[PDB]
Amino acid sequence: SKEYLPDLLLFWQNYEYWITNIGLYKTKQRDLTRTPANLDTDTEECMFWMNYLQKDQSFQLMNFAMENLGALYFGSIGDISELYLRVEQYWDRRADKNHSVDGKYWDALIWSVFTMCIYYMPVEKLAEIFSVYPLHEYLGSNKRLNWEDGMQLVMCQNFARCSLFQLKQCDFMAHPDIRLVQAYLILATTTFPYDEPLLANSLLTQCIHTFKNFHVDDFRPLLNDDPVESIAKVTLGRIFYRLCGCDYLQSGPRKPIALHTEVSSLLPNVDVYREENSTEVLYWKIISLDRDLDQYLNKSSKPPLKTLDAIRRELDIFQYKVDSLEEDFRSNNSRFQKFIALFQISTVSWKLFKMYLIYYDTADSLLKVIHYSKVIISLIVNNFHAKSEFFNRHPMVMQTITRVVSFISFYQIFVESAAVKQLLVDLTELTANLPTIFGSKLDKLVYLTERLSKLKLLWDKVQLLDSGDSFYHPVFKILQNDIKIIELKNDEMFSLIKGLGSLSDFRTIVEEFQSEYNISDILS
Amino acid sequence: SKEYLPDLLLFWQNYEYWITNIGLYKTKQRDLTRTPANLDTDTEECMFWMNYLQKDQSFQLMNFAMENLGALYFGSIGDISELYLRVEQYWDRRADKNHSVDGKYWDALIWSVFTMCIYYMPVEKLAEIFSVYPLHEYLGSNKRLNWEDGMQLVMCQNFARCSLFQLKQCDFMAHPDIRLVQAYLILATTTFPYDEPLLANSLLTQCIHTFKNFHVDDFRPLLNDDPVESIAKVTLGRIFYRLCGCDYLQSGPRKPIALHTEVSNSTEVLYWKIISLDRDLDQYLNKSSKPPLKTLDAIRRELDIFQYKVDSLEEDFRSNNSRFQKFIALFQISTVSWKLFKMYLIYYDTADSLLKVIHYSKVIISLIVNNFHAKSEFFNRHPMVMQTITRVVSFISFYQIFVESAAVKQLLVDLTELTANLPTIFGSKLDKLVYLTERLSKLKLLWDKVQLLDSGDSFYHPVFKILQNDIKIIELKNDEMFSLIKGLGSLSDFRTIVEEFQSEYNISDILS
Amino acid sequence: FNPVRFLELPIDIRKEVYFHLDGNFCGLEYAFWLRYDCLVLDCFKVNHLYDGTLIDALEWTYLDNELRLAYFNKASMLEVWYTFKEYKKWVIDSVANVSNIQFNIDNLTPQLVDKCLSILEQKDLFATIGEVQFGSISVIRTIRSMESMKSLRKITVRGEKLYELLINFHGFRDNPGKTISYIVKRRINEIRLSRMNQISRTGLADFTRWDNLQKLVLSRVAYIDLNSIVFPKNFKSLTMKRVSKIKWWNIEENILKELKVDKRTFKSLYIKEDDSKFTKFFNLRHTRIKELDKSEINQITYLRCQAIVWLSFRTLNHIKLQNVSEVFNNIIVPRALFDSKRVEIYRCEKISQVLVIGSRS
Amino acid sequence: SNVVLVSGEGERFTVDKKIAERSLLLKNYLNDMHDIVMPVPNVRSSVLQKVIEWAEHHRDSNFPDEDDDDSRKSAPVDSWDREFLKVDQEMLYEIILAANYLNIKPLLDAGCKVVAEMIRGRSPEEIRRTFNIVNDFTPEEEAAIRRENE
Structure with a gap:
């Protein structure tokens, strides 16, 4: 039988939340009796x-x-x-x-x-x-x-x-x-x-x-204002929406105080449709599409298809606005702005069709994932040329590839296909050719992909058991214990106690693989 | 006519939110071009x-x-x-x-x-x-x-x-x-x-x-917990309730990120319950709305319950910690009682209100004068007596300006004598409290020597315009728009009396 | 026609098949076998699977001495009808909790409206019912029951006889049993109107009592006046179906009273420069939109013009328009709802002048 | 300046760029950087040739909108489109799959209107009286319905 796949794709959402998102970027092992003052x-x-x-x-x-x-x-x-x-x-x-x-x-x-x-x-x-x-x-x-x-x-x-x-x-x-x-x-x-x-x-x-x-809520100036006050409100609004974008890019279990009072596009004291759309609130609107997609990672409920179709419609709308940006390319500032908006809109398209593939398994969803992965490959390889290599240094190219090259690895463990293997070879070619300014972070990504590659081999040599109710294989236990270990490493109860306190071949194969390829090597 | 008294008592809520709370204690005049970094x-x-x-x-x-x-x-x-x-x-x-x-x-x-x-x-x-x-x-x-x-x-x-x-x-x-x-x-x-x-x-x-x-939102011990974790969650609950208390004691316009999610080992729970009752009272300072009678009656019933609980508390003479706890709890419940009957006097004008205000004011005075002796003088150094005596002498002076009574006058003389006898560890806040009391007394003399007028619709007196311009000046001083502008770039005889009082008795002297 | 390859066909394409196949399931009708098709159950499983964004016209009726769900055609012909245990069993088949069920008053008789409400209340639930379709004994019978109606989100009101009694603020009478009970007005999230001529006559169209409106539908109304209508706090949407000549806001008269400039000189002040970048995607071809010149105005005066535009336009996200055939007073809309696809006009060849204010940077 | 599509069987087809802008995917696959060949997997070459012929027909036709939900219901059944899609069922479903993959809304709408006219006018009490993918129907319930049929 090949019916183990939908529950495993639903498990990918939990794995993507805790390994790729939180445990790779947003987790720091601290020990206050050992850090130098x-x-x-x-x-x-x-x-x-x-x-x-x-x-x-x-x-x-x-x-x-x-x-x-x-x-x-x-x-x-x-x-x-x-x-x-x-x-x-x-x-x-x-x-x-x-x-x-x-x-x-x-x-x-x-x-x-x-x-x-x-x-x-x-x-x-x-x-x-x-x-x-x-x-x-x-x-x-x-x-x-x-x-x-x-x-x-x-x-x-x-x-x-x-x-x-x-x-x-x-x-x-x-x-x-x-x-x-x-x-x-x-x-x-x-x-x-x-x-x-x-x-x-x-x-x-x-x-x-x-x-x-500053207690400013509406950045639309009034008629009884100083001109200096109106210019101040406009600049403060641009700072605010850039701050909301840079605020969502750090969320997780260590960031409890949210600034997110910005209402998303058509599901909230600051409704983001009222501002005249500059570069900053356009970037915020694309980040809001991203945050409306990626809230269903750790949640147990499934997203409605009404929401995903609204995301598709508005994705095409902002896709066409990027085409109709219309600035002068001789100054090449608009070139880097166009690259940012186009790479973000391809990222949001990719996440939309990944959730289409996982939650509902709709018409050629895997093929659209392969297509937008090739579009991201095109938009990164096109800037391997001269004078614009630093375009591949904006940090969103480190996020999106980390979302892609994990997932296409994970699916390659369980579903053998022809286009997926060539796409994974293209991602393996692209991952080493990224700029070296992401340093150890880039190195960690390769290790994760390499571990997933080894996780194909243990899937092949070991036969799937059957209990009638649920399925059993060491890959399931190892993928479960990865989330268990990193959720254990994001528990601050033991920091509280250090503050104010006084203190079967199945299991064998699982312990061998976790002793050989430990997931805690990816922790910062 | 004599209709200015209820609207003026409602104006006292505005004045007590801004001037006695935000202006005196919670406002720092900063200048970034001259402050030594x-x-x-x-x-x-x-x-x-x-x-x-x-x-x-x-x-x-x-x-x-x-x-x-x-x-x-x-x-x-x-x-x-x-x-x-x-x-x-x-x-x-x-x-x-x-x-x-x-x-x-x-x-x-x-x-x-x-x-x-x-x-x-x-x-x-x-x-x-x-x-x-x-x-x-x-x-x-x-x-x-x-x-x-x-x-x-x-x-x-x-x-x-x-x-x-x-x-x-x-x-x-x-x-x-x-x-x-x-x-x-x-x-x-x-x-x-x-x-x-x-x-x-x-x-x-x-x-x-x-x-x-830490992401701990419920502090009750379970059965499968490590007992160390249960002791830690009990202690974290204690820290959370006292942190809600010290959070409420620093609210205002320059602090928008609040922790108050709770609504309305025995001592700390009693302490937070009294402070939460105080919060439910003084949530109506800045608002334009008024509390219902059922709300104030439920506050009075719970006030009598906690009054009996403080009466159910003990005290030890060889253990000064117990007297210190007893004075803090009894002074807090008396402060909450005084604020409740002050709201009775202001909002609804119910009978037997002003006598209750004078009664609990004398209870506050007795609780302070009892500590004027030896061995317990430091009990008057807690910030709650500074806050409470500030509100009390401000409201008694503001009431003495517009309503005359002999018992209120003797109460004002007692407050004025006790105000100079507060310790010198409060310092500049005590001196500015004395200055504010003196300014309200000179405002009473100005109310005495100047006739109240009326154009047929609303009243006119210099005292009203001065008390309104104090709130307007301090609301102008509590704006960060000028600092934001400096951050982005480098861009009649009536009026004569009002301007002479504002030129002699300035409002910016109580700031910091 | 093979209904076994059509079911192995994937989801959203099959949805797009049923999208053009809303009411006419057949084409006079053999209604015995038409219910138990696999295609009809596929329609309702997909319709429950999105939100109800398909046909959604599920009524409670009392037919054959039984309370049952029923779907009506676009011409109000009965298509299917379910017992509630059946529909619950196959909703459970779909999901592997219903809350959105319409309730007419116009497509029923009051002698069975009373029995429908009585047995529907006393039987098990008196819940799982979203819309209430008004448009007089049966109306007052329904009003007495809406206090226990836990989860409703919509009210539709038909022509002008029932509207001015219930919706508008103008009355403030002494009849508590006749009007709403103020707990139903708290969760009132959408309001539609139909079959009337004038919304603002014999008084004023004021929605200030109804809190929490995020949408509103004006359908098949002759003459409205936006200048008369005020709007609640936290108001979001504005949709208008086929209407006659209507009046718009007084925004252009307020720009004309700001710059102290004449009408014909303002007609040479409205530039038509930036019409070839993005408005060619709007596919209008009749309304050529026009903006204000950047050289013919200062910066702060342009910001003040935007501030004048947002006055009497305070909180709105999108304005949807079907064929309106005439607009009197000079459409001049903000770009913040025009640069994104929020202000949507669809079939208007008779409209010609659309002014848009805001920076397209 | 011509643009080459690639089919599934491998036959590379050549259209013009303004012709290929009928697709809502060529308009966003070629607009990467202006400083030419799009693969279309799992589409047989005859199907992509029919889609290309449809795109070459309506080069100057005003389709209603993208988000006009009522103009799609008030359906224009076009004459050349009704002449065009008159094929057997599997060719029609492959054209509709290709139009969904190419993100072409009007061809998708026309194909779904043809399938809607097919599923609307099914045989009364002949194919509608035969439910055939029988699931969540017990033999007891089916026997109850067939006993309630008389």
Whole structure:
């Protein structure tokens, strides 16, 4: 019999929630009796990584971001030609021995902008601007590494830490101001929310508290307002919808305080149909389609087909709006905006037809999954060319492939097909050719896929037993115990007790495979 | 006509929400272009102010807390003889070079306990323990200042700041743990929520994040549980109910992330039930609506039930912890009773209301004057008597402005005499309370010397326009739109009397 | 025709087959065997499987001295009829809890409406019934029973005799038994109207009493006036079927009273520049939409124009229009409901002027 | 500039880009980056040739909308479409499967209207009196119905 498949596809939703989503990005094994305390206070380290930079290097980073990366910061900070004055003021106020809170806020904002500049610059321009040598003079690592060898990410993470250190010098908890939130919306474009998810959740809770301090709900200005007040409300609305997007991209069992009062498209105090659609709320609408799909992962109920068909209709509507974006390609900012919107709309299409395949098994759903996987392959391989390799550095290409190359692996364990194997070979070709800036995270993904490849072999050599009621095989036990182990590793009761307390060949094959390929290797 | 009295008593709800609560205690005038961003991050300050404390002095602080302060820390840390081991570990580990995060959490907890010891200690033992002279050698102030001048408040603020500095060395943002909530609830016993208000709001939002990290929503022990887990869930329930209490004691416009999901071992449950009754009373300050009579009658019936429960409580004379608990519980239930009959007087104008207000006001005065003797003077240092006496003297002065009575006048003289006799550990809040009482008395003189007029539809008097402009100025001062604009870019004889009163008796003097 | 390959055919294509096959299951009728087809049970299994977004016209009737579910055609001819245990058994077959069942008053007799309500109340449930179709003894008999009607979400009211008594706020009378009981008005999520001529005559069309409206349907009405109608808090949708000449909002008269500019000079102020990017997808071909020029206005004045547009347009998500054949006062809609596919006009060749305000950036 | 579709059997067909924009998939598979061949699996080449001929017929026809649920009900049974889909049943279902895969709403609507006219006018009391996929029907219930038939 081949009727074990629908319950196993329904088990994929639980496995995708706990292994691929939570346990790979959003779980950090902490142990408070072993972490070193912050007695350095990041003072010597960020003192070095602040006086390492020079002035001409900073203005070249600003010119690079001015002519390339505008689709990321243009909703957050606005127009960056205003910020050249702030860079001049930083390089003039660097010699001052008494700083103000406002000046240090502007300095933290431009250091976050520099962190994004370091994250999205290709290795050739970064080697022509910066020098490899004094970092190896300082960091004490191996003196043979280059920028393409894994030292660009170290400089990016240390610039993010220096932005956070300049936030620490403000007493940012005692002075709530908007330059926290904007700075986090520049730091939420790197892999900073995936490096330290605990610190990202704490800063994001501070950003939610800082935003809700202003008590602004409607960003449509009124008729009895200062013109400055109306421009302030427009910029605050753009910051708000970018903050909602960067807020949904970190959800899970460690993020309890939601900002999600934004009502999704036609199932809620902020109904998102009333704003004039700029880039930021368009990105939020695509993230809202994503969040309306991926709430049924850990839930036991099944999604209605009414909802999935509404998602299909609105998916085609925003698909056509991306075509009718209509900007000038000579400035190439619209090129990167078009890539972001097109990759997100292909991701949401893929998740829609994955849920079509799993929950209801509709007309050629697997074939549409293969088709949109090939579309994602096309949209990533097309940017293997020159001058636009860094387009493959926006973090959503790390998420979506992690959703794809797991699932097409998992289905390959149980249903043998011809197109699926060639698609898996294409994904295995694509996974190694992703940029090396995702580092260890990228490495972990390959390990997961490799484990699933080995999980095909144990499916083949072992015969499926039968009890009449339910089915029994070691693959089922191992896939169950993976979710059991990672749900055990997200239980903070033992942290509470460390706080204020005083403290059959079936089983053999399962213990052999879990002793050989442990799932806890993917935990951060 | 004489119709201004009910609408003016309804105006008192607005004035009591903004001026006596948000303006005096919960508003900090900030300026970001002039405030020194401390690049040192208080390392030079707290390094000295932690080298000032000595070991045997700290153990005498812990002994005083064990003897006399149990009804405060029992909600947060339970028993303090269990904490002596952690104090020993800190004093042995202090001489090291490296440190661990869990140790620094225990250090933040015991420094918060030290702050609670300093804030409630009487002045004679505090003078016998600590010197006065290195304080003025560091601060550069007068050598002739004493503890009653205000140096004990300065030492309390510096210990709170050094506890926060130990929290900042933990990177408590990137490492949530339950000792943050306990070390904040010990710092919530003082007037640290009134020195730095939005810093306390940020710490309380961090504590709400740290609590909801655990995902425990029901605190009852099951059968298949580890008993350690059941003890942990009971203790976490205690911390949750007291955290709801200290959350309600910091509400307002500058704190929108609230924990109040609960609606309406025996002591903490009694304490939260009294505070929740207080919450259901004072939820009608900022609102434009009015409570029904059935609501106030149910509050009165439950008030009599908890009055009998406090009458069912005991007291011990050799154990001062029991008298401290008894005074706190009886003062809380008397404050809730006074606020209930104040709402009776304001909203419905029911007979036998003002006599009940004077009755429970004299009960509050008797509970304070009973502690004016020896051996129990520090009972008046709890923040609830500052809040309660602020509301009482404000409402009695506002009632004396517009309604004359001899018993009310003698009550006002008693409140005014007791107001200057409050201890000097409240300091600037006490001075601004005296200034607000003096401003309302001069407003009474202005009400006396100026005729009330009427154009045929509504009344007109300078007192009404001044009391309205106070609320309008403080609602203008509690807006962050100007800070948002500065963040985005760098972009008749009647009127004469009103402007002279506003130019002489300014409203911005009660702010911070 | 092979009904065994048609059933192994997948779900949504078979749905699209039944989408064009709504009422006419046959084509006078041999109603004995027509119920027990596999295709009819397939229709109702798929119809229960989505939400009820197909035919959905399931009535309670008292036929053959028995209370049973019944489906009526588009011309109100009886197609199928189920005993409730049968329909429960095959809904359980589909799902491997019913709550959406319509209730006419117009397609029934009051001497059996009373018995239907009495035995339906005292028998087991008096629940699982969503819509209530009004449009006078039987009406008052139904009103007395709606207090126990736990899960209803819809009210349809037919022509103007029954509307002004029940729905509009104008009365405020002293008859509690005649009108609603204010617990049924809390869960009243949609309201449809039909078979009338004027909604706002002899008073004012005010919906302020009815809280919690997320949709509204105006069908086959002669003359309405949007300027007269006010709307509740938390109002979402607005759908209008085939109507005659109607008046729209006073938005253009408020822009004309803002800039202090004339009508003919405003007709040279409405640009028609950005009509070839995305509005070609709208497939209008009759209404050429027009916007305001960016060079002929300031920034803050344009934001104030948007603020004037959102006044008397406070909370609305989508406006749906069938053939209306005329609109008097100068359609000028916001782009935030026009740039997405929310403002949807479908069959209007007689309409010509659509103005749209907002940035298309 | 021509666009090549690929069938399931392997025969590569060639149409124009403006012709291929009748499909709501070529319009979103070719619009990746402007700085040519689309595979269609599991479609026999005759079926894709018929779909291509249908797309070449209606090059300048105004179809109603995408979300007009009442214009689909008020059905235009087009003359060339009714002449076109007059094939046997399996060819018709393969065309409808191809139109669902190619995301072409009007051909899907026309095919489903043809199948709806087939299923509407079934033989009364001949095929409707024979239920044939008999499940959730006991022999007791079937015997009860066949006893209630007389």
